[PDB]
Paper text:
The complex belonged to the P212121 space group while the Ec- and StTae4-Tai4 belonged to the C121 and P6122 space group, respectively. The results indicate that the active complex is a heterotetramer in solution, consisting of a Tai4 homodimer [named subunit I (cyan) and subunit II (orange)] binding two Tae4 molecules, consistent with the status of the Ec- and StTae4-Tai4 complexes in solution. The four heterotetramers in the asymmetric unit are likely the result of crystal packing, and represent no significant biological relevance. Clip I, composed of the residues from Gly132 to Leu142, adopts similar structure to that in the former StTae4, but a remarkable shift (∼5.4 Å) in the terminus occurs. It is worth to note that the conserved residues Cys135 and Cys139 form a disulfide bond (DSB) to stabilize the flexible loop, while there is no DSB between the two residues in the loop of the former one, where the two sulfydryl groups are in opposite directions. Moreover, the overall conformation of the Clip II in the present structure is different from that in the former one from StTae4-Tai4, which may be adaptive to the binding and inhibition of EcTai4. However, the dominant feature of the protruding loop in Tai4 is a shift by ∼3.0 Å compared with the former EcTae4, which may be adaptive for inserting into the active site of different effectors within this family. It is worth to note that the conserved residues Cys41 and Cys101, located in α2 and α5 respectively, form a DSB to stabilize the super helical conformation during the inhibition process, where there is no DSB formed between the two residues in the former EcTai4. The total buried surface area in the interface of EcTai4 dimer with one StTae4 monomer is 895 Å2, with 641 Å2 contributed by two helices (α3 and α5) from StTae4 with two helices (α3 and α4) from EcTai4 subunit I, and 254 Å2 contributed by the lid loop from StTae4 interacting with the protruding loop from the neighboring EcTai4 subunit II.
Residue numbers in the entry:
A (entry chain A): 1 to 161
B (entry chain H): 3 to 161
C (entry chain P), D (entry chain I): 20 to 116
Write the structure that this text describes.
Amino acid sequence: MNRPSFNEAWLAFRKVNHSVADVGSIIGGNVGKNITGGYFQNACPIRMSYVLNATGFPIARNSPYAKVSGADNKFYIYRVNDMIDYLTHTMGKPDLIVNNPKQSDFIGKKGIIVVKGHGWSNARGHVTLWNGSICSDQCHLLNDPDNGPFVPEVGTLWILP
Amino acid sequence: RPSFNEAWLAFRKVNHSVADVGSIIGGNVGKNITGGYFQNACPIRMSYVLNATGFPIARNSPYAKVSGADNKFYIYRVNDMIDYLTHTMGKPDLIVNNPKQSDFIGKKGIIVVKGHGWSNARGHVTLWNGSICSDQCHLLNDPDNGPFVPEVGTLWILP
Amino acid sequence: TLPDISTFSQQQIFENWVQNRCIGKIADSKSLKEDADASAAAWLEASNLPAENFEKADEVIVSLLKQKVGGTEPGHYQILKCTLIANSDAIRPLKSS
Amino acid sequence: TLPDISTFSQQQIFENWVQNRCIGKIADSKSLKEDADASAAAWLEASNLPAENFEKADEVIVSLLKQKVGGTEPGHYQILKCTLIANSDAIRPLKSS
């Protein structure tokens, strides 16, 4: 096929849904080394990378995105921008695109959600899983109490089966 | 050129920390010092000497200047202060490579020591009395240079 | 080795004075404020601009430091903010006379 | 009112990563070290260089910091030193892939 299944994905995510230090322990290898050295601080694309590597849709070794390797010798994309581009290059057209996104807009659907917007100086946005009610971490949709200065402008969703 | 005895005595009045030199001169010089914009008092002290001995820095010098409470002008860049000495007194009396005190034995006046190693200054400008300096000379073999190595020393003798 | 201050552009010399000073304003150490200030002084010696510019630029630094710079970590991003301030629109007009 | 990171050149993004990280190494505050490393990670995100380059660059930083740069005053001039390390001959080959 082409995309992982939702329950698998949600579980793998549960495995990496911890601090970035933990994510580093877990994956180890160069991912770990870069996390320990303080080079990677945002673990969001690492987790999404892990989810794809753990559900039988591995990031290819020759994929045109910046990646480093883990203990498992699999590959982890470490930039949010590269992670987001990777989703569209590797899964095709999304099923949903929404300007000024809030939870109600994604109701009754499920899978990988991307929220882009301004206010984070280190991240164009956020990539996470959405189960039709909540995200596997934080959605950062309109009014999320963890947004801070982040104003979400577009949300896009690829449905997972 | 200002008389040496006066130069020397005048210099003693500003031979203190930058903060002090600022309190003393006041005005825009003291404003910039209070602000921490000026940290090197070397050219300001030399300005003070010149101003206090009847050879004051002209308002329209082609060198960056700023006024004190006495409404006299004070140059805040060592690079400018140095160029100023040649612009105003002309040729020097002595120019010596690898400058040591022995090269200036038996002559009094304004001494400039250029060299490398200090990131905020191409050299030092001070008074020399024939054996010792107003503050530190920074000649070769001097123990308080640090990273500074003097490459040339130039003396304009004062009467 | 390290490059000399003089091998930079007058614009860069000014930007670096601003950044160094700004680090000074954001430090909570006193020896780091002192370091910042000695550093900034080194850029001011090599600059060809009038003192007054540096005064106005200090004003702009104080103003722009109030601005909030956020991210995915909880900190205030002051270090990043200093580099941004040195390259801001508000500072640019002070690069000339 | 501050410029976005993306409006810097790639060379400037890498230089700023070096400058920021360096400031992290000379800070004594836990607070300032954290601010520094979060700041650097923004630059890293914006850069197109592989992570290896950044690791090498950190090595170079550690080496160039043991250089003494001095002035006509007490001080360590570490903040200046960081700005110089960022624009150093040693760091320059890491701006390319």
